[PDB]
Swiss-Prot record:
Originating species: Homo sapiens (Human)
Tissues with expression: Tends to be up-regulated in cancer cells with RAS mutations, including lung cancers and adenocarconimas (at protein level).
GO molecular function annotations of the record: RNA polymerase II-specific DNA-binding transcription factor binding; transcription factor binding
GO cellular component, one term: nucleus
Region (Required for nuclear localization): 1-35
Keywords: ANK repeat, Apoptosis, Chaperone, Cytoplasm, Nucleus, Repeat
Protein name: 26S proteasome non-ATPase regulatory subunit 10
Coarse class of the protein's main subcellular location: cytoplasm
PROSITE patterns, alphabetized: ANK_REP_REGION, ANK_REPEAT
Annotated region described as Interaction with RELA, given as residue ranges: 37-224
Keyword Chaperone: yes
Length: 224
């Protein structure tokens, strides 16, 4: 289906490398020309998962950090869409790991919330701030703790992510872990230093928020 009013963006999105090759070779201006969504062929190649097209456009020296009018860089799209190899090629040409889009999210945020384990690692080995804050002051860790992604939490802890940052509602990963009753997640979090003292904007500690057989477990865990 047609996703763009610019031909090169449609060839890019659909996998039509050879046609794209011949087109841009004819006019090298097409590789950086933008469409209705301010996207180049690089953006649409990132979206569709056409690694070989990405590599061709990168060889050409297309800028690799240009944001579509939603704020999304190629690295945002690749990370969200789960294109392991494309993310690799993007970090290979110095793609800005910490770029942010209109909503305030970095690529890692999309990696963490969609469980792109290999891509998260690649962003983090690549210098992504693990404590990057969205527009609600929420972190990759908030997402992982809230969604119960144990694998992702281990990844984030290893890369020195904080566990004691407050979102605009004043909750820390541990608050959320507790609130959605994430069993191991909250245990693993207080074992690696998640505080039982910080107050969300309801005077509530993570202890208070905790439900059932937990809550005081995170106090018999910290006084054992």
């Amino acid at each position: 289906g047609c996703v763009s009013n610019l031909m090169v963006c449609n060839l890019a999105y659909s996998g039509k490398l050879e046609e794209l090759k011949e087109s841009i070779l004819a006019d090298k201006s097409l590789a950086t020309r933008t469409d209705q969504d301010s996207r180049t062929a690089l953006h649409w190649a990132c979206s569709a998962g056409h690694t070989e097209i990405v590599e061709f456009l990168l060889q050409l020296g297309v800028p690799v950090n240009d944001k579509d009018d939603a704020g999304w860089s190629p690295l945002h799209i690749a990370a969200s869409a789960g294109r392991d190899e494309i993310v690799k090629a993007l970090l290979g040409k110095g793609a800005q790991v910490n770029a942010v889009n209109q909503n305030g999210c970095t690529p890692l945020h999309y990696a963490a919330s969609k469980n792109r384990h290999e891509i998260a690692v690649m962003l983090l080995e690549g210098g992504a701030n693990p404590d990057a804050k969205d527009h609600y002051e929420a972190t990759a860790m908030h997402r992982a703790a809230a969604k119960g992604n144990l694998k992702m939490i281990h990844i984030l802890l290893y890369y020195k992510a904080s566990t004691n940052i407050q979102d605009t509602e004043g909750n820390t990963p541990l608050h959320l872990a507790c609130d959605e009753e994430r069993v191991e997640e909250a245990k693993l979090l207080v074992s690696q230093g998640a505080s039982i003292y910080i107050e969300n904007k309801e005077e509530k500690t993570p202890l208070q928020v905790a439900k059932g057989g937990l809550g005081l477990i995170l106090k018999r865990m910290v006084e054992g």
